[PDB]
Design an enzyme around this catalytic site. Structure first.
Site, mmCIF file in Angstrom:
data_model
loop_
_atom_site.group_PDB
_atom_site.id
_atom_site.type_symbol
_atom_site.label_atom_id
_atom_site.label_comp_id
_atom_site.label_asym_id
_atom_site.label_seq_id
_atom_site.Cartn_x
_atom_site.Cartn_y
_atom_site.Cartn_z
ATOM 1 N N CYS A 153 -63.439 -86.012 -14.958
ATOM 2 C CA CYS A 153 -63.730 -84.682 -14.439
ATOM 3 C C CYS A 153 -63.291 -83.585 -15.398
ATOM 4 O O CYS A 153 -63.394 -82.404 -15.059
ATOM 5 C CB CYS A 153 -63.081 -84.481 -13.062
ATOM 6 S SG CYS A 153 -61.328 -84.038 -13.052
ATOM 7 N N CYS A 206 -58.130 -84.040 -17.253
ATOM 8 C CA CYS A 206 -57.100 -84.534 -18.141
ATOM 9 C C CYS A 206 -57.091 -83.744 -19.455
ATOM 10 O O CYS A 206 -56.037 -83.603 -20.083
ATOM 11 C CB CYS A 206 -57.269 -86.060 -18.284
ATOM 12 S SG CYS A 206 -56.920 -87.091 -16.774
ATOM 13 N N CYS A 225 -58.066 -92.428 -13.505
ATOM 14 C CA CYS A 225 -59.373 -93.073 -13.639
ATOM 15 C C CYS A 225 -59.374 -94.074 -14.794
ATOM 16 O O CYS A 225 -59.764 -95.241 -14.629
ATOM 17 C CB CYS A 225 -60.486 -92.060 -13.887
ATOM 18 S SG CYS A 225 -60.742 -90.808 -12.612
ATOM 19 N N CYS A 262 -53.528 -87.657 -11.634
ATOM 20 C CA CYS A 262 -54.851 -87.116 -11.340
ATOM 21 C C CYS A 262 -54.711 -85.633 -11.059
ATOM 22 O O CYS A 262 -54.779 -85.187 -9.910
ATOM 23 C CB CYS A 262 -55.498 -87.868 -10.182
ATOM 24 S SG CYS A 262 -57.249 -87.551 -9.968
ATOM 25 N N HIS A 297 -39.323 -89.998 -4.126
ATOM 26 C CA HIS A 297 -38.582 -89.858 -2.877
ATOM 27 C C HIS A 297 -37.082 -89.988 -3.084
ATOM 28 O O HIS A 297 -36.307 -89.220 -2.504
ATOM 29 C CB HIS A 297 -39.128 -90.918 -1.929
ATOM 30 C CG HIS A 297 -38.390 -91.064 -0.644
ATOM 31 N ND1 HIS A 297 -38.597 -90.240 0.445
ATOM 32 C CD2 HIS A 297 -37.489 -91.997 -0.251
ATOM 33 C CE1 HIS A 297 -37.831 -90.648 1.441
ATOM 34 N NE2 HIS A 297 -37.153 -91.710 1.044
ATOM 35 N N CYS A 302 -35.795 -86.746 -4.230
ATOM 36 C CA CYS A 302 -36.427 -85.582 -3.617
ATOM 37 C C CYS A 302 -35.389 -84.669 -2.966
ATOM 38 O O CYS A 302 -34.466 -85.151 -2.296
ATOM 39 C CB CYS A 302 -37.406 -86.026 -2.539
ATOM 40 S SG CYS A 302 -38.252 -84.648 -1.740
ATOM 41 N N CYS A 308 -38.631 -82.563 5.984
ATOM 42 C CA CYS A 308 -39.326 -83.533 5.146
ATOM 43 C C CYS A 308 -40.813 -83.546 5.489
ATOM 44 O O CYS A 308 -41.210 -83.277 6.634
ATOM 45 C CB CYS A 308 -38.670 -84.904 5.353
ATOM 46 S SG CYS A 308 -39.582 -86.360 4.761
ATOM 47 N N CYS A 357 -46.721 -87.289 3.134
ATOM 48 C CA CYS A 357 -46.141 -87.412 1.799
ATOM 49 C C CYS A 357 -46.009 -88.874 1.384
ATOM 50 O O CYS A 357 -45.422 -89.687 2.109
ATOM 51 C CB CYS A 357 -44.767 -86.741 1.780
ATOM 52 S SG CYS A 357 -44.049 -86.686 0.117
ATOM 53 N N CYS A 413 -42.084 -85.579 -11.215
ATOM 54 C CA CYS A 413 -42.537 -84.263 -10.773
ATOM 55 C C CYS A 413 -41.443 -83.492 -10.054
ATOM 56 O O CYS A 413 -41.433 -82.255 -10.090
ATOM 57 C CB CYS A 413 -43.714 -84.426 -9.813
ATOM 58 S SG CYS A 413 -45.060 -85.347 -10.542
ATOM 59 N N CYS A 429 -46.031 -80.567 -5.911
ATOM 60 C CA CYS A 429 -46.831 -80.935 -4.753
ATOM 61 C C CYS A 429 -46.003 -81.043 -3.490
ATOM 62 O O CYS A 429 -46.471 -80.670 -2.411
ATOM 63 C CB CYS A 429 -47.525 -82.266 -5.016
ATOM 64 S SG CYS A 429 -48.497 -82.261 -6.532
ATOM 65 N N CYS A 456 -47.022 -85.000 -1.602
ATOM 66 C CA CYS A 456 -47.425 -85.876 -2.698
ATOM 67 C C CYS A 456 -48.501 -86.823 -2.190
ATOM 68 O O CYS A 456 -48.383 -87.368 -1.087
ATOM 69 C CB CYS A 456 -46.201 -86.655 -3.202
ATOM 70 S SG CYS A 456 -46.538 -87.929 -4.475
ATOM 71 N N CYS A 515 -50.614 -89.708 -6.902
ATOM 72 C CA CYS A 515 -51.756 -89.680 -7.803
ATOM 73 C C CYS A 515 -51.573 -90.507 -9.072
ATOM 74 O O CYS A 515 -52.568 -90.797 -9.737
ATOM 75 C CB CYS A 515 -52.117 -88.228 -8.156
ATOM 76 S SG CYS A 515 -51.062 -87.401 -9.347
#
Ligand code: SF4
Ligand code: SF4
Ligand code: FCO
Ligand SMILES: [Cl-]
Ligand SMILES: [Fe+2]
Ligand code: NI
Ligand SMILES: [S]
Lengths: 283, 484
Positions: free
Chosen positions: A18, A21, A121, A159, A208, A211, A232, A238, A247, A259, A265, A268
Site C-alpha cells: 500500500c 512502508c 505483508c 503495518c 503488555h 505497558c 486498561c 487491545c 511501541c 496505539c 493495539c 500489527c
C-alpha cells in the site's frame, strides 16, 4: 554519513503493498530521510520517488544489479501473489516482456546480499493473504524458499513498521558488515533474529508486560469507552498481550502518541495479523 | 513533412503511488490514443466479507498508505450510518483535524516528492539520476536550486504533518483514532497547543514556499496550461462536515460536465468492467449491488481498475474538481502571481477559465490553492474544538444494516458502502478517487479521465517522451486506491 561516503546500493520493489512502508520511512526523525538517502544508502530503484520511469528505470536497476551482483540490498514491500501465473502483480515491462513480482523476485532475489522484507505483508503475508483473498499472496521468505533461493531474509514487520525499525535494521546490518565483512556480518544479524525473523532490539520485548496500564489490567479496571484513558484497553480489544514490539517506549510520529494510548493495539507486527488479531474491537 | 505513429509503453509509471502501466499512441508529435492499466490487485472487497464490521475501519486503510485517513473516514461514516451511531459534535471536529492534517501532508508530498522532479533536476546521485537525457528542465540555476531546497525542507514539513495526524489519530500511516461513533481520544489543551505549533510551521511553508513555487514554476511552463483538458468534466461528493446535519460541508457536492453544473445523485454511479479483469456478468452495477469477481485472463481487458461512470459520463476528481465545483476565492499570493507572472486578473478559481483550469499545470495550481484553502479550515476547527469534551459513542453492532460514507480523499471523491447481515460484513464496496481518474474504457469504449486527458499531449521527441507521465502525475494517482 557524508555525501562522499560509502553508500551501498538498494533496490526497493513493491509487490502487493500500500506504499505505507515507504511513507513510514519518510517519517524517520533521526537520521532524517534526506540523510538516509544522501549519506547512508544509494536508493537506485524505488518506483514512488525515483527520477526515471518505465523500461529505463528497470534497465537501470538491471545494470546496477550486474555491477553489484551479490552485494545489493533488496527491499520488498508487499506480498508476492502466485496465482494466475503472477498476473495479480506486474511491476514493470522491458523489451516487450511484462515482469511479474514472481519474476522479479526470481531474478533479483538470488543476487542480493540480503532481502529485507519490510512490513507485515512482505514478512508474513498480511492483509493480502488474509481470509477472503484469492491471489495467492505469499510472504517473501516462503516464496524464496519454495523457489530454492537461499539469500538471507530479515523481516521488519508492522503495518506499517516504525521508521526506526527499518532504518535501525539497516544500521544494524551495515555495522555488522563493517566489522565482519558481508558474510560474517549477515551471520551476526541472523543471530539476533527471533523465530519469526525479526531483530530482537526492536521486537524482543512484549507490549503488555511493559505497558503503562498494566496495573489497571491486573486490577481488572477496564475502560468501557475508548475515550476513558485511565483504564486498561483489553475489553476494547487491545492485543498488547500477544504482541512483540517496542511501541510502548519509542511511540509513534516523533513520540506524539501510540496505539495503546490513543485506542488499542491491533497486533500489527505479528505473523497472524490480521486474522489472528481480529475482531480488533473485542478481546 | 510530418511523422507517423509511435506506440510508447511506460511500466512502471514512477513518482505516483502504486502499479500503473501507460501506453500511448503518438502520431505526428501528439498523443492520439491512450490506455491506462492498473497492474496490481489485492481484493479488499472480498477480504472484508465475514468480518466484524468494526474491523473495516482498520482493514480499509491498508488500501493505501498515502491516503489512509480518507479510507478511515469513509469507512467510519459508512459504519456510523449502518450502526445508527450519532457522532458527538466534538468528535466530528476531531475527525476533521485528524484528516485535514493529511491533506496538507499529501499535497506537499505530491508536489515536491512526486511531481517536482518533472521540472527540477535533483542532486547528482540516486534516486535523482539517471533520467531522460532531454528531460526538458527549464528552470534557471537559482530557481532549480530553490526547488531542491524546498524538496528537502518539504521532507520535514510533510513529516510534521504526520505528527499532527498522530496527535489525535494515534499514529500515521494507519490511524487508530477514528472508529464508528467518533474519535477515540478527546483533545486536551496541551495536545491542542502541540497541534497548533506544528500547524504554524506548515502554514508558513505553504504560504511562503509551496504556493509561490507552483505559480513560479508554472510561469516557466506556460505551455502546460494548454494541454491535458480531456473531458473537462468533474465530480465532487462532499467532504468535511461543518455541522451535525450531514447537509453542510467544506467542499459541497456537485457534477460538472459539458460546460454545465449539475447536482450529485449517487444512484447514477455504475461500474463497468468490459476492459477490466473482472467477470463479465458483474458489469454495470451500482455500488450498493457491487461485485468483485477477478478475471485476470479475460480477453480484451487491460486493467484491475473498474470503469466508474456517472449517468454515463467519464469524470475526473481531485483538487481541480473540488475547486472548480466550489469556486472559492483564490489565495492572495495566487491572485498576485497570476497578475505579475501571467497577466491574468482573477479573484475566484473559475476566473482561470475552463481551459487553463482543466490542464496539466492547472491541476498542480488547483492542488496548491486547495492546500492554502485547507489552512483556513483547520484554523477554524482549532477555534471550534472544545478541549476535554467527549468525542465518541459506543454503539452496539447491528445484526442487519447498511450504510454509505462519502468523503473527498486528497486525490478525489471516495465512497464506501457496507451491508451487514448476521452481524458480519455481507458486502463492502469501495469507489475511490484514483478509480475515477485512472480507469480504463467503459463498455461503450469511452475512455477514463486520464486516458482522455492524455489526448493531445505533445511528444516532440519520442526518445524523451516526458510529457506523458507529466500529465499522469498532475492527477496524483495512487493505484492502490484505484484497484483495492
Ligand atoms: S491489554 Fe493493552 S492496555 Fe491493557 S495493560 Fe495490556 S497492553 Fe496495556
Ligand atoms: S502498538 Fe500494536 S498496532 Fe500499534 S504499531 Fe505497535 S504493534 Fe502495531
Ligand atoms: N487520496 C487518496 Fe486515495 C486515492 N486515489 C482515495 O480515495
Ligand atoms: Cl487521506
Ligand atoms: Fe471497488
Ligand atoms: Ni490512495
Ligand atoms: S493516495
Amino acid at each position: 554519513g557524508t555525501l562522499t561516503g560509502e553508500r551501498p546500493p538498494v533496490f526497493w520493489l513493491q509487490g502487493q503493498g500500500c506504499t505505507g512502508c515507504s511513507v513510514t520511512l519518510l517519517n524517520s526523525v533521526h537520521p532524517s530521510i534526506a540523510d538516509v538517502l544522501l549519506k547512508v544508502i544509494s536508493l537506485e530503484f524505488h518506483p514512488t520517488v525515483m527520477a526515471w520511469e518505465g523500461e529505463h528505470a528497470i534497465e537501470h536497476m538491471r545494470k546496477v544489479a550486474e555491477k553489484f551482483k551479490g552485494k545489493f540490498f533488496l527491499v520488498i514491500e508487499g506480498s508476492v501473489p502466485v496465482e494466475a501465473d503472477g498476473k495479480y502483480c506486474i511491476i514493470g515491462e522491458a523489451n516487450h516482456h511484462e515482469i511479474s513480482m514472481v519474476d522479479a523476485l526470481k531474478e533479483f532475489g538470488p543476487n542480493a546480499a540480503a532481502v529485507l522484507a519490510v512490513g507485515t505483508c512482505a514478512a508474513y503475508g498480511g492483509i493480502p493473504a488474509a481470509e477472503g483473498s484469492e491471489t495467492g499472496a505469499t510472504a517473501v521468505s516462503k516464496f524464496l524458499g519454495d523457489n530454492g533461493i537461499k539469500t538471507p531474509v530479515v523481516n521488519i514487520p508492522g503495518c506499517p513498521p516504525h521508521p526506526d525499525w527499518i532504518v535501525g535494521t539497516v544500521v544494524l546490518a551495515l555495522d555488522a558488515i563493517k566489522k565482519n565483512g558481508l558474510e560474517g556480518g549477515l551471520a551476526e544479524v541472523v543471530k539476533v533474529l527471533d523465530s519469526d525473523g525479526r531483530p530482537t532490539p526492536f521486537f524482543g520485548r512484549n507490549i503488555h508486560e511493559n505497558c503503562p496500564y498494566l496495573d489497571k489490567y491486573d486490577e481488572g479496571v477496564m475502560s468501557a469507552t475508548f475515550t476513558d484513558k485511565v483504564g486498561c484497553r483489553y475489553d476494547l480489544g487491545c492485543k498488547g498481550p500477544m504482541t512483540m514490539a517496542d511501541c510502548f517506549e519509542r511511540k509513534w510520529n516523533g513520540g506524539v502518541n501510540w496505539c495503546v494510548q490513543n485506542a488499542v493495539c491491533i497486533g500489527c507486527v505479528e505473523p497472524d495479523f490480521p486474522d489472528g488479531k481480529s475482531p480488533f474491537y473485542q478481546a | 513533412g510530418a511523422t507517423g505513429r509511435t506506440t510508447i509503453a511506460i511500466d512502471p509509471v514512477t513518482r505516483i503511488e502504486g502499479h500503473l502501466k501507460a501506453e500511448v499512441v503518438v502520431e505526428n508529435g501528439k498523443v492520439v490514443d491512450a490506455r491506462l492499466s492498473g497492474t496490481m490487485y489485492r481484493g479488499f472487497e472480498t477480504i472484508l466479507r465475514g468480518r466484524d464490521p468494526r474491523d473495516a475501519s482498520q482493514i480499509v486503510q491498508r488500501i493505501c498508505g498515502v491516503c489512509p485517513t480518507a479510507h478511515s473516514t469513509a469507512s467510519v461514516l459508512a459504519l456510523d450510518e449502518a450502526f445508527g451511531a450519532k457522532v458527538p459534535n466534538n468528535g466530528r471536529i476531531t475527525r476533521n483535524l485528524i484528516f485535514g492534517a493529511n491533506y496538507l501532508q499529501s499535497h506537499i508530498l505530491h508536489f515536491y516528492h512526486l511531481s517536482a522532479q518533472d521540472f527540477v533536476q535533483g542532486p547528482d546521485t540516486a534516486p535523482f539520476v539517471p533520467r531522460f537525457p532531454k528531460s526538458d528542465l527549464r528552470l534557471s540555476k537559482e530557481l532549480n536550486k530553490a526547488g531542491v531546497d524546498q524538496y528537502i525542507e518539504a521532507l520535514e514539513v510533510r513529516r510534521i504533518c504526520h505528527e499532527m495526524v498522530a496527535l489525535f489519530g494515534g499514529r500515521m500511516p494507519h490511524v487508530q483514532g477514528q472508529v464508528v461513533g467518533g474519535a477515540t481520544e478527546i483533545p486536551t489543551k496541551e495536545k491542542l497547543v502541540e497541534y497548533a505549533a506544528r500547524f504554524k510551521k506548515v502554514r508558513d511553508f505553504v504560504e511562503q514556499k509551496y504556493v509561490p513555487v507552483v505559480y513560479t514554476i508554472g510561469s516557466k511552463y506556460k505551455d502546460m496550461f494548454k494541454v491535458g483538458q480531456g473531458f473537462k468534466a468533474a465530480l465532487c461528493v462532499g467532504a468535511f462536515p461543518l455541522d451535525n446535519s450531514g447537509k453542510k460541508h467544506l467542499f459541497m457536492p456537485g457534477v460538472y460536465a459539458k460546460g454545465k453544473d449539475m447536482p450529485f445523485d449517487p444512484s447514477k454511479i455504475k461500474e463497468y468492467v468490459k476492459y477490466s479483469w473482472f467477470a463479465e456478468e458483474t458489469t454495470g452495477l451500482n455500488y450498493k449491488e457491487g461485485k468483485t469477481i477477478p478475471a485476470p485472463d479475460k480477453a480484451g481487458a487491460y486493467s484491475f481498475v473498474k470503469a466508474p461512470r456517472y449517468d454515463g459520463l467519464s469524470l475526473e476528481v481531485g483538487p481541480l474538481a473540488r475547486m472548480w465545483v466550489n469556486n472559492p476565492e483564490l489565495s492572495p499570493v495566487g491572485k498576485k502571481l497570476l497578475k505579475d507572472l501571467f497577466g491574468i486578473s482573477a479573484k475566484k478559481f473559475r476566473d482561470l477559465g475552463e481551459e487553463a483550469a482543466f490542464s496539466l499545470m492547472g491541476r498542480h495550481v488547483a492542488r496548491a490553492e486547495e492546500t492554502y484553502y485547507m489552512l483556513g479550515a483547520i484554523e477554524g476547527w482549532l477555534k471550534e474544538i472544545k478541549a476535554g469534551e467527549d468525542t465518541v459513542v459506543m454503539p452496539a453492532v447491528p445484526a442487519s444494516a447498511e450504510g454509505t460514507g462519502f468523503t473527498e480523499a486528497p486525490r478525489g471523491s471516495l465512497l464506501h458502502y457496507v451491508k451487514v447481515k448476521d452481524s458480519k460484513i455481507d458486502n463492502y464496496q469501495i469507489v475511490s478517487a484514483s478509480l475515477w481518474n485512472c480507469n480504463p474504457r467503459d463498455d461503450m469504449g469511452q475512455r477514463g479521465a486520464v486516458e482522455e486527458a492524455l489526448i493531445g499531449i505533445p511528444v516532440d521527441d519520442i526518445q524523451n517522451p516526458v510529457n506523458v507521465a507529466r500529465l499522469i502525475r498532475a492527477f496524483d494517482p495512487x493505484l492502490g486506491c484505484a484497484v483495492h
